[PDB]
Amino acid sequence: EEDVFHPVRAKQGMVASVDATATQVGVDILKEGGNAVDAAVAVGYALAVTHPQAGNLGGGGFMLIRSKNGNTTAIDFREMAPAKATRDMFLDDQGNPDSKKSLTSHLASGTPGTVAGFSLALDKYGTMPLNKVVQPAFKLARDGFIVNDALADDLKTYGSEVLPNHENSKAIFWKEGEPLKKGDTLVQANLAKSLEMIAENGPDEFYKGTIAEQIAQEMQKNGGLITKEDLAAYKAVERTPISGDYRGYQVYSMPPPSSGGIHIVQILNILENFDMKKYGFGSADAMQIMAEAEKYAYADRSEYLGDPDFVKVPWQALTNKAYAKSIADQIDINKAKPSSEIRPGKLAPYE
Amino acid sequence: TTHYSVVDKDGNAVAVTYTLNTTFGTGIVAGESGILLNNQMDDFSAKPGVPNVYGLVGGDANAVGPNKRPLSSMSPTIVVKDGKTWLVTGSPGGSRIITTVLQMVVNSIDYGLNVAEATNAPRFHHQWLPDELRVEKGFSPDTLKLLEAKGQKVALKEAMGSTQSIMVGPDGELYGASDPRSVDDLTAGY
């Protein structure tokens, strides 16, 4: 009764996502007997259809899995730069980065890993076949769904900047010269065909089949770099999670190629040295301490983080409590330190 | 970018954060596949010391290279309490993902907020460069005055993130919350 905000409650299973339709797809899978991984893959495919803003088959991401028995693991299905990519590929003739090239051109794309990631997880930790978890998404693509406020707003705002500039994109997301409006039905026949082939041929359809061919051609015809060799060489990777201990609670998150786990643990390590509970939420003291701690972590991020398969990341030093303590001792609760006075930390004494 | 969480009847948990990077990515569909293409390459450091779209900078470690995976900030996360899965969370937000998830953890552990309370609480963020303490609407004018007195450069900006979280009760019961910042989302179970 003292609570202003109440959580949704359930006794058996639960799914939380950015889209109602996708969430319901996941719940149905659980009700059908699928485990968390089965449901997660189903939701992932469903969002690839109902949330084109971010849900996808053409991107990548990370998955954290923790079994009922405590086994915790991470699935890295981050995109890989094409084999033809070069260090200075985004610099103009003057040597200055061109944001247009890295955000809106065909050179902005990395080799997609979502399909590979979901299959690696499903095959090892799931219980259902790919065709069964892809079916819900397939139906949504084939039969369509109603455009809601979220999708309509995104199409009008972010979509207007890029979707109408490409013929194939415009044919799907635009209508009568304008972005699809709330209430309109969005049918994605081509995506439905892609989903249908993945369900029947497996992930190879994406990395070596018809889909791969379509991606390679899109690239070759428009100055892009992703080739069939790139797609055929892509692999999702299971890695050990980065973890820490905060006041007796264990925190597990993503390891490199993500900087998330390392810095969340680093910052918590720093905060552990202060009585946060005493200051309380929304207090200037609590915010001051955290803002300061965050500066050091982001400074370290700019120097030490990258793909672990190409560079050695000093994750042990970065998540070392003694190192965190040395940072905590520098924080003045009454005076912020300018970023110009903060540089990446010296990790030698902690490694 | 988008994040979703799942917990089944047996207690298994999964947290997934995936993306095209910016909204709709490049906005380019791959031929007749109907599949949108990512613009994840902007997550690499194009040139040492020059910021990308999220104000993040890098050097040699995150430089563009063939077959290399660009550094991410995505943080699907699970917090364990008394040896058992307790909080499953994550969020989109580029450079802000780290601090958004951090706040979910701190709110849950230090402030004892239930999953919905932690989700609806205002957020703040400082990423070193640029040198500004970014805040959402919702903080007391009295508190912000004190922060400015301490030397923080407070900047009121757009809402940050979209957490989709699940907390596991002591008796195994589930509690969930979808972010007020994103409409048409949902947390549901059975």
Ligand SMILES: N[C@@H](CCC(=O)O)C(=O)O
């Ligand atoms: N591409 C960013 C995510 C951007 C977003 O959350 O919108 C990353 O991997 O850190």
Ligand SMILES: [Ca+2]
């Ligand atoms: Ca919401």
